[PDB]
Amino acid sequence: LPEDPKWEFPRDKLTLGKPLGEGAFGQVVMAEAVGIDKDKPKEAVTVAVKMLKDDATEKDLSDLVSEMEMMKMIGKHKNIINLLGACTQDGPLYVIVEYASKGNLREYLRARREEQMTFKDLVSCTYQLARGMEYLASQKCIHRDLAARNVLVTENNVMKIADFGLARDINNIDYYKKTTNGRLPVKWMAPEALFDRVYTHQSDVWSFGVLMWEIFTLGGSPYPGIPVEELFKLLKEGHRMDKPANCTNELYMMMRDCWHAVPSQRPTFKQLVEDLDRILTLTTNEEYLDL
Amino acid sequence: LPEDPKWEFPRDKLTLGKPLGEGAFGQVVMAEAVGIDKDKPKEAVTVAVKMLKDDATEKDLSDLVSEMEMMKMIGKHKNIINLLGACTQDGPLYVIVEYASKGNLREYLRARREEQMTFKDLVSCTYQLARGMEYLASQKCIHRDLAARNVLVTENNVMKIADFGLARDINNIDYYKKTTNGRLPVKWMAPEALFDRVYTHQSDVWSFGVLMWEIFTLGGSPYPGIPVEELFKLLKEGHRMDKPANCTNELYMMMRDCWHAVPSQRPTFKQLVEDLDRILTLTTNEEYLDL
Ligand SMILES: Nc1ncnc2c1ncn2[C@@H]1O[C@H](COP(=O)(O)OP(=O)(O)CP(=O)(O)O)[C@@H](O)[C@H]1O
Ligand SMILES: Nc1ncnc2c1ncn2[C@@H]1O[C@H](COP(=O)(O)OP(=O)(O)CP(=O)(O)O)[C@@H](O)[C@H]1O
Ligand SMILES: [Mg+2]
Ligand SMILES: [Mg+2]
Ligand SMILES: [Mg+2]
Ligand SMILES: [Mg+2]
């Protein structure tokens, strides 16, 4: 793999640890990185390392490189997990990212159904992710795998968009159309992406709506009781998920707006941020309190 | 041998066939049984027949009878192979069981490393076997030989626990302790059964963990590269198998739970079923699909 000193990290200063993610297969691990922080030379930092699975194909590697390059290019944002470095020379490919001590969003929410979640907290999570995606979209890049499992939570409860394994740079085409193959998160995909294989910022918006649903159901699984294979027919029929109990009517309509059948009629992340900010501010300044 | 009309089958209506099982020695054969199905009188049914090996001892017979009686007593369950009848009078002892057209679990999995196995399918196999064992344990009986080689697969891919050659009824003692002898499946045995000769539902749980490992390695052999004789020392040292590549971290921890050094701390089949059901449902309703 090509060299890139800027992000290269000394393997010798990296020590792999335990696997991360209940539903993961062990290719993502915790790890100690000594000197990863330019400032602190001898200070060891707990990080997360992603590598190829035991028996990786040719494309597999190609997909991990892309994930890394995507992270390299988009730049820093408070609501996007940070790339810290990579070990690409004389050894297995390791992509080092900051460690989120509270796991993915789904595990995080399920554990607080232990400081329980309040309506305000749910709106806050949603607002933060809309900001992260607004930023990603402003870079003319699509994520393609927006879901609770791909959102991490820091020690201080900050929302971090992660796993850019399917992310694409659409700066020159304005829309990505795959002709290849591979497993895809169909229950999070917009109809046009599923049926026409067309992805855009608007298809990410659709996925954001599903994410909102996961957040308000506190880590629930989309289209409950519906085998993934049965979803295709339902979508062709215009099926849409019901409103989660913890969701206000206003937020449910926002959810349904994200699922508008016409891509261009769905709100933009810019609009979602503005509406979510209004809703967050009002809730923060008006919520009822237990005395 | 005592008579028992209920299960007795006319030899004249039974015609032995080819041997079954690559690793078997020929004492298990395919066979045609005319009238085995009370309903269909002239309809011939393909079944499996187990008999004593050429040069059977006194105990050998005693062990086949017990196997038959165990099957007679436990009752029917979707995930346990069915006893159809037996030829015990005026001739060699024949134990007739339903035929599983896709062989034992190991052969079945190895052949799909030909409709290949998906993660969901592996969880499904595991779930079914946990159900079978949960049922067996509810009858206060232990299997003592739970392994891929002792699991059969039907034409419609249903998992069937089989070979009750070592099974014991522990309704009156709550735990079986052998003082006799005989060859045992040490690589599938819990430390307390190996070292203290004590067997319980919890030792079957340990064996279930090894079975999970076989399933997720697609018919692999436990403790790879380790001669059976070398295992004893490793176990005394607390050795445990590494996670199979196809296994999620969550399922590996379930595996390790089955191998807890403290028998009572291992999960019960009831708990395994509940956790496996949750995992199976989630996977079925959320898996990524290739379009
Ligand atoms: N930086 C990090 N800190 C903490 N946990 C992390 C983490 N990165 C990943 N994880 C955990 O590992 C899980 C899987 O990570 P990731 O989403 O990057 O997988 P992946 O892209 O390798 C494969 P897939 O695309 O199939 O998920 C996450 O859902 C989360 O639980
Ligand atoms: N009902 C059945 N249908 C199809 N194949 C069967 C079968 N019963 C047994 N077999 C095949 O024969 C093999 C051996 O069967 P079984 O496990 O009953 O042996 P066994 O108890 O006689 C001796 P051991 O205890 O040494 O295995 C199985 O692993 C499987 O491949
Ligand atoms: Mg992921
Ligand atoms: Mg990926
Ligand atoms: Mg056997
Ligand atoms: Mg036997």
Q: B6: Cβ–Cβ under 8 A, 6 or more apart, which residues?
A: none
The experimental method is X-ray
Distance B163 CA to ligand 5 centre (A): 5
**Quick one: which of B233, B183, B189 has its CA closest to B207?**
B189
Angle subtended by helix axes B269-286 and B201-216, to nearest 10: 30
Angle subtended by helix axes B201-216 and B119-138, to nearest 10: 170
Residue A27: closest CA among chain B residues belongs to which residue? B245
Q: Distance between CA atoms of B51 and B102, rounded to whole angstroms?
A: 21
A157: left (phi over 0), alpha (psi -120 to 50) or beta: left
DSSP state of A15: E
Dihedral in degrees, nearest 10, Cα atoms B222, B224, B230, B231: -30
Task: Decide: B234 and B259 in contact? Cβ < 8 Å.
Answer: no
| Token representation of residue B81 | 């192979």
Q: Min CA distance, A121 vs chain B (Å)?
A: 26
Q: Is any atom of ligand 2 closer than 6 Å to the C-beta of B170?
A: no
Relative to beta strand A198-199, strand A176-177 is antiparallel
**Quick one: which of B70, B72, B102 has its CA closest to B84?**
B72
DSSP state of A220: P
Q: Distance between CA atoms of A290 and A210, rounded to whole angstroms?
A: 31
Task: Decide: B203 and B142 in contact? Cβ < 8 Å.
Answer: yes
Distance A271 CA to ligand 5 centre (A): 65
Q: Is any atom of ligand 1 closer than 6 Å to the C-beta of A104?
A: yes
DSSP state of B162: -
Expressed in angstroms, the distance from the first to the final Cα of chain B is 60
Q: Min CA distance, B165 vs chain A (Å)?
A: 36
Task: Decide: A240 and A255 in contact? Cβ < 8 Å.
Answer: no
**Quick one: which of A272, A239, A281, A282 has its CA closest to A130?**
A272
| Token representation of residue A135 | 């930023």
Task: Decide: A96 and A47 in contact? Cβ < 8 Å.
Answer: yes
Q: Distance between CA atoms of A185 and B286, rounded to whole angstroms?
A: 8
Q: How many CB atoms lie within 10 A of CB B151?
A: 28
Write the CA distances from B244 to A20, A23, A285, B122, B288, integer angstroms.
15, 14, 51, 12, 21
A37 has catalytic annotation: no
Q: Which run of H or of E encompasses B168?
A: strand B168-169
Q: B224: Cβ–Cβ under 8 A, 6 or more apart, which residues?
A: none
Domain B100-281, CATH class in plain words: mainly alpha
Distance B214 CA to ligand 5 centre (A): 15
Relative to beta strand A198-199, strand B14-19 is unpaired
Hey, where are the domains in chain B?
Answer: 1-99, 100-281
Q: What angle do CA A279, A282, A287 make, to 5 degrees?
A: 115
Q: B286: Cβ–Cβ under 8 A, 6 or more apart, which residues?
A: A187, A221, A222, A228
- The SS3 assignment for A189 reads coil
Q: Distance between CA atoms of A270 and A286, rounded to whole angstroms?
A: 24
| Token representation of residue A136 | 């990603």
Q: Which of A145, A242, A257, A290 is catalytic?
A: A145
Q: Distance between CA atoms of A74 and A103, rounded to whole angstroms?
A: 23
The resolution in angstroms reads: 2.0
Write the CA distances from B113 to A27, B32, B160, integer angstroms.
21, 32, 21
Q: Which residues of B97-132 are buried (b: 16+ CB within 10 A; e: fewer)?
A: bbbbebbbbbbbbeeeeeeebebbbbbbbbbbbbbb
Helix ranges (DSSP H) in chain B: 58-74, 105-110, 119-138, 191-195, 201-216, 228-236, 249-258, 269-286
Q: Which run of H or of E encompasses A126?
A: helix A119-138
**Quick one: which of B51, B151, B54 has its CA closest to B100?**
B151
Atom 1 of ligand 2: nearest residue by CA position: B99
Q: Min CA distance, A29 vs chain B (Å)?
A: 11
Q: Distance between CA atoms of B286 and B289, rounded to whole angstroms?
A: 9
Q: In what order do the strands lie in the sheet with A28-34?
A: A14-19, A28-34, A44-50, A94-98, A83-87
Task: Decide: A198 and A177 in contact? Cβ < 8 Å.
Answer: yes
Q: Distance between CA atoms of A118 and A102, rounded to whole angstroms?
A: 17
Write the CA distances from B95 to B32, B65, B81, B104, B178, integer angstroms.
13, 9, 12, 18, 25
Expressed in angstroms, the distance from the first to the final Cα of chain A is 60
Q: How many CB atoms lie within 10 A of CB A145?
A: 21
Q: How many CB atoms lie within 10 A of CB A21?
A: 19
Place of tokens 């609501």: A79
Task: Decide: A129 and A148 in contact? Cβ < 8 Å.
Answer: no
Q: Distance between CA atoms of A215 and A193, rounded to whole angstroms?
A: 23
* DSSP conformation letters of B229-264: HHHHHHHHTT--PPPPTTS-HHHHHHHHHHT-SSGG
Yes or no, beta carbons of A184 and B291 under 8 Å apart: yes
Q: Which atom of ligand 1 is nearest to the CA of A100?
A: 3
Beta-bridge partners for A95: A50, A86
Asked: is B1-99 a CATH 3.30.565.10 domain? The reply is no
